[PDB]
Amino acid sequence: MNQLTAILKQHTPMIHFQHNESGATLRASEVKPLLDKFILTKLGNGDIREGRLYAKKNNWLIDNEKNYALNYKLSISLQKKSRLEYLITSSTFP
RNA sequence: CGCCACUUCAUGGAAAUAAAUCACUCACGAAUGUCUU
Numbered sequence A: 001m002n003q004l005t006a007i008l009k010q011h012t013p014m015i016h017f018q019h020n021e022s023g024a025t026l027r028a029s030e031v032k033p034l035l036d037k038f039i040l041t042k043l044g045n046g047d048i049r050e051g052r053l054y055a056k057k058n059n060w061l062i063d064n065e066k067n068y069a070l071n072y073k074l075s076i077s078l079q080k081k082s083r084l085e086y087l088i089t090s091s092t093f094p
Numbered sequence B: 001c002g003c004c005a006c007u008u009c010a011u012g013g014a015a016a017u018a019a020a021u022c023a024c025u026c027a028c029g030a031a032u033g034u035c036u037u
Helices: A028-043 A048-057
Strands: none
Touching: A028 A048
């Protein structure tokens, strides 16, 4: 397999700084670095150094020398562009 | 429920690498091989 497709459900409203665009959704520049660390941690059974050695062994690293990055491409897109906008404050008001 | 903001604004790597460096053609052709006293 070359492509992985997943459908995400939202439980809490994300605080997004680029809400102006109608296609504003979860940013992959945030997901990918955390997912890379999560997978390397899981590959090494809770240790990121063993997990990097595992990824280094099976040629899964973009660079074998200095980064945790894994060689995959991540894209997050909206299917239906209808969204709910929330005002989140720490003060009650009518 | 009231009141109230601060902080952070680029670093590391790559900075040219290989292929072709002259090729083909012409490399002398024609006249004179003695002439006039």
